[PDB]
Short mmCIF file of C-alpha atoms in Angstrom, two decimals:
data_model
loop_
_atom_site.label_atom_id
_atom_site.label_comp_id
_atom_site.label_asym_id
_atom_site.label_seq_id
_atom_site.Cartn_x
_atom_site.Cartn_y
_atom_site.Cartn_z
CA UNK A 1 -11.35 -1.93 -22.42
CA UNK A 2 -7.56 -2.42 -21.73
CA UNK A 3 -5.12 0.43 -22.36
CA UNK A 4 -3.20 -0.50 -25.55
CA UNK A 5 0.36 -1.70 -25.12
CA UNK A 6 1.85 1.24 -27.06
CA UNK A 7 1.37 3.51 -24.03
CA UNK A 8 3.77 1.27 -21.99
CA UNK A 9 7.44 0.42 -22.01
CA UNK A 10 8.03 -3.13 -20.78
CA UNK A 11 10.52 -5.95 -20.53
CA UNK A 12 10.45 -9.71 -20.19
CA UNK A 13 10.59 -11.47 -16.85
CA UNK A 14 13.73 -13.62 -16.19
CA UNK A 15 12.05 -16.89 -17.21
CA UNK A 16 10.57 -15.46 -20.46
CA UNK A 17 6.96 -16.13 -19.42
CA UNK A 18 5.64 -12.70 -18.39
CA UNK A 19 5.73 -8.97 -19.05
CA UNK A 20 7.12 -6.44 -16.55
CA UNK A 21 5.70 -2.94 -17.11
CA UNK A 22 8.53 -0.44 -16.73
CA UNK A 23 6.89 2.83 -17.73
CA UNK A 24 3.50 4.30 -18.53
CA UNK A 25 3.97 6.87 -21.29
CA UNK A 26 0.47 8.27 -21.75
CA UNK A 27 -1.38 10.90 -19.75
CA UNK A 28 -4.93 9.61 -19.65
CA UNK A 29 -7.18 9.90 -16.65
CA UNK A 30 -7.64 6.11 -16.51
CA UNK A 31 -5.33 3.19 -17.28
CA UNK A 32 -6.58 -0.38 -17.51
CA UNK A 33 -3.31 -2.29 -17.50
CA UNK A 34 -3.54 -5.10 -20.10
CA UNK A 35 -3.62 -8.58 -18.65
CA UNK A 36 -1.23 -9.63 -21.43
CA UNK A 37 1.16 -8.25 -24.03
CA UNK A 38 1.58 -10.31 -27.22
CA UNK A 39 0.39 -13.46 -25.51
CA UNK A 40 2.38 -13.08 -22.34
CA UNK A 41 0.75 -12.21 -18.99
CA UNK A 42 1.56 -8.89 -17.32
CA UNK A 43 2.96 -9.94 -13.93
CA UNK A 44 4.76 -6.90 -12.48
CA UNK A 45 4.56 -3.11 -12.26
CA UNK A 46 8.25 -2.19 -12.02
CA UNK A 47 10.08 0.42 -9.94
CA UNK A 48 8.78 3.98 -10.56
CA UNK A 49 6.67 2.86 -13.55
CA UNK A 50 3.93 5.44 -12.82
CA UNK A 51 6.23 7.80 -10.93
CA UNK A 52 4.84 11.34 -11.00
CA UNK A 53 1.84 10.53 -13.24
CA UNK A 54 -0.24 13.41 -11.87
CA UNK A 55 -2.87 12.90 -14.59
CA UNK A 56 -4.10 9.53 -13.33
CA UNK A 57 -7.40 9.27 -11.46
CA UNK A 58 -8.08 5.52 -11.77
CA UNK A 59 -5.77 2.55 -12.39
CA UNK A 60 -6.93 -1.03 -12.93
CA UNK A 61 -4.46 -3.87 -12.64
CA UNK A 62 -5.04 -7.39 -14.05
CA UNK A 63 -5.17 -10.49 -11.86
CA UNK A 64 -1.83 -11.56 -13.38
CA UNK A 65 0.08 -8.80 -11.56
CA UNK A 66 1.99 -10.33 -8.65
CA UNK A 67 4.25 -7.44 -7.66
CA UNK A 68 4.15 -3.64 -7.41
CA UNK A 69 7.71 -2.29 -7.29
CA UNK A 70 9.25 0.50 -5.25
CA UNK A 71 7.94 4.04 -5.78
CA UNK A 72 5.67 2.60 -8.51
CA UNK A 73 2.97 5.24 -7.98
CA UNK A 74 5.03 7.75 -5.98
CA UNK A 75 3.60 11.18 -6.77
CA UNK A 76 0.34 10.13 -8.45
CA UNK A 77 -1.32 13.03 -6.66
CA UNK A 78 -4.72 12.63 -8.37
CA UNK A 79 -4.99 8.84 -7.98
CA UNK A 80 -8.39 8.22 -6.34
CA UNK A 81 -9.02 4.54 -7.10
CA UNK A 82 -6.85 1.57 -7.93
CA UNK A 83 -8.33 -1.88 -8.56
CA UNK A 84 -5.91 -4.30 -7.16
CA UNK A 85 -5.82 -7.79 -8.65
CA UNK A 86 -6.43 -10.90 -6.63
CA UNK A 87 -3.04 -12.05 -7.87
CA UNK A 88 -1.17 -9.31 -5.97
CA UNK A 89 1.42 -10.67 -3.49
CA UNK A 90 3.76 -7.77 -2.67
CA UNK A 91 3.81 -3.96 -2.66
CA UNK A 92 7.36 -2.63 -2.39
CA UNK A 93 8.50 0.41 -0.49
CA UNK A 94 7.07 3.89 -1.17
CA UNK A 95 4.82 2.40 -3.86
CA UNK A 96 2.02 4.91 -3.09
CA UNK A 97 4.10 7.62 -1.45
CA UNK A 98 2.33 11.01 -1.68
CA UNK A 99 -0.81 9.58 -3.31
CA UNK A 100 -2.75 12.33 -1.55
CA UNK A 101 -6.08 11.63 -3.29
CA UNK A 102 -6.25 7.90 -2.54
CA UNK A 103 -9.24 7.83 -0.20
CA UNK A 104 -9.60 4.07 0.07
CA UNK A 105 -8.07 0.83 -1.11
CA UNK A 106 -9.21 -2.79 -0.96
CA UNK A 107 -6.43 -5.28 -0.49
CA UNK A 108 -6.72 -8.70 -2.16
CA UNK A 109 -6.83 -11.94 -0.23
CA UNK A 110 -3.45 -12.79 -1.81
CA UNK A 111 -1.42 -9.85 -0.43
CA UNK A 112 1.62 -11.09 1.56
CA UNK A 113 4.04 -8.16 1.95
CA UNK A 114 3.73 -4.39 2.39
CA UNK A 115 7.11 -2.64 2.28
CA UNK A 116 8.32 0.40 4.21
CA UNK A 117 6.53 3.75 3.76
CA UNK A 118 4.15 2.30 1.16
CA UNK A 119 1.29 4.68 2.02
CA UNK A 120 3.54 7.42 3.40
CA UNK A 121 1.77 10.80 3.06
CA UNK A 122 -1.43 9.25 1.70
CA UNK A 123 -3.34 12.12 3.24
CA UNK A 124 -6.83 11.11 2.05
CA UNK A 125 -6.79 7.45 3.08
CA UNK A 126 -9.58 6.83 5.61
CA UNK A 127 -10.13 3.10 6.23
CA UNK A 128 -7.75 0.19 5.68
CA UNK A 129 -8.48 -3.48 6.24
CA UNK A 130 -5.44 -5.72 6.16
CA UNK A 131 -6.34 -9.33 5.21
CA UNK A 132 -5.02 -12.20 7.28
CA UNK A 133 -2.71 -13.15 4.36
CA UNK A 134 -0.58 -10.07 5.10
CA UNK A 135 2.49 -11.49 6.85
CA UNK A 136 4.94 -8.56 6.54
CA UNK A 137 4.33 -4.81 7.03
CA UNK A 138 7.30 -2.46 6.82
CA UNK A 139 8.18 0.51 8.98
CA UNK A 140 6.31 3.76 8.34
CA UNK A 141 3.78 1.95 6.14
CA UNK A 142 1.07 4.46 7.10
CA UNK A 143 3.34 7.38 8.03
CA UNK A 144 1.56 10.75 7.82
CA UNK A 145 -1.81 9.28 6.80
CA UNK A 146 -3.47 12.26 8.44
CA UNK A 147 -7.02 11.18 7.58
CA UNK A 148 -6.55 7.48 8.50
CA UNK A 149 -9.33 6.75 11.00
CA UNK A 150 -9.52 2.94 11.14
CA UNK A 151 -7.05 0.10 10.59
CA UNK A 152 -7.83 -3.60 10.95
CA UNK A 153 -4.65 -5.61 11.47
CA UNK A 154 -4.03 -9.15 10.20
CA UNK A 155 -5.07 -11.67 12.85
CA UNK A 156 -1.62 -13.16 13.33
CA UNK A 157 0.47 -9.99 13.33
CA UNK A 158 3.63 -10.41 15.40
CA UNK A 159 5.13 -6.90 15.38
CA UNK A 160 4.14 -3.32 14.67
CA UNK A 161 7.15 -1.92 12.81
CA UNK A 162 8.96 1.35 13.50
CA UNK A 163 6.80 4.44 13.04
CA UNK A 164 4.03 2.35 11.48
CA UNK A 165 1.32 4.91 12.37
CA UNK A 166 3.55 7.96 12.91
CA UNK A 167 1.62 11.14 12.21
CA UNK A 168 -1.79 9.41 12.01
CA UNK A 169 -3.45 12.17 13.97
CA UNK A 170 -7.00 10.97 13.17
CA UNK A 171 -6.45 7.29 13.99
CA UNK A 172 -9.07 6.10 16.49
CA UNK A 173 -9.72 2.40 15.74
CA UNK A 174 -7.21 -0.45 15.61
CA UNK A 175 -9.03 -3.72 15.01
CA UNK A 176 -7.62 -7.21 15.50
CA UNK A 177 -5.12 -6.04 18.06
CA UNK A 178 -3.44 -9.27 19.21
CA UNK A 179 -3.14 -10.82 22.62
CA UNK A 180 0.63 -10.49 22.26
CA UNK A 181 2.69 -8.35 19.88
CA UNK A 182 6.07 -6.58 19.73
CA UNK A 183 6.46 -2.86 19.11
CA UNK A 184 9.06 -1.05 17.10
CA UNK A 185 10.14 2.48 17.94
CA UNK A 186 7.63 5.33 17.86
CA UNK A 187 4.78 3.20 16.48
CA UNK A 188 2.06 5.67 17.56
CA UNK A 189 3.95 9.00 17.56
CA UNK A 190 1.57 11.83 16.65
CA UNK A 191 -1.57 9.68 17.09
CA UNK A 192 -3.44 12.32 19.06
CA UNK A 193 -6.91 10.80 18.72
CA UNK A 194 -6.36 7.25 20.04
CA UNK A 195 -9.15 6.51 22.56
CA UNK A 196 -8.20 5.82 26.16
CA UNK A 197 -9.36 2.19 26.09
CA UNK A 198 -7.11 1.68 23.06
CA UNK A 199 -4.08 3.39 24.64
CA UNK A 200 -4.52 1.21 27.74
CA UNK A 201 -4.73 -2.10 25.88
CA UNK A 202 -1.64 -1.05 23.89
CA UNK A 203 0.32 -0.20 27.05
CA UNK A 204 -0.87 -3.53 28.50
CA UNK A 205 0.64 -5.21 25.43
CA UNK A 206 3.95 -3.56 26.38
CA UNK A 207 4.31 -0.41 24.26
CA UNK A 208 6.64 2.08 25.96
CA UNK A 209 6.84 4.64 23.14
CA UNK A 210 5.06 7.95 22.68
CA UNK A 211 1.40 8.43 21.83
CA UNK A 212 2.20 11.96 20.65
#
């Protein structure tokens, strides 16, 4: 089905083997990012490439995409579904900032890194399951996800970064909470709905910050 290349601006990757998508020019309701342009694989969605694309409802990325750059989908206020590739390794900071219609997202088994504030103000996001491949999660990654009810952490997670769940006033379930973990500042500020058994096991792990 792939969206034709003429709706994208792109460059070459440093080693001349892949296409970096730098801008989406169209205004369709659905983009299927081509897996290749002129025989090269599409490996990256660059900084701000879909910035402010309020028309988009669905985005499909090919398995060749390894990287989603900073603020890539910042302001895609109608984005309701995005098919992430199994090639995806990293989502840079603010990549889905203010994607207020993103109700769910399925992370691939390849995802390594989630930058700061990636789902900041994703006010429709309900469930998130972080695969065990996820080694790095930046501060504020789920800041102001006011509808976020359930988060499953990666099994080996060593720290919960600063303000990770700040403003998650509907958060009630935190799966895969480790036997030992370090807490940044204000991890659970504004999390009014955390159950008591959860709050106690978190204090027992050593959190001294605010639950509200």
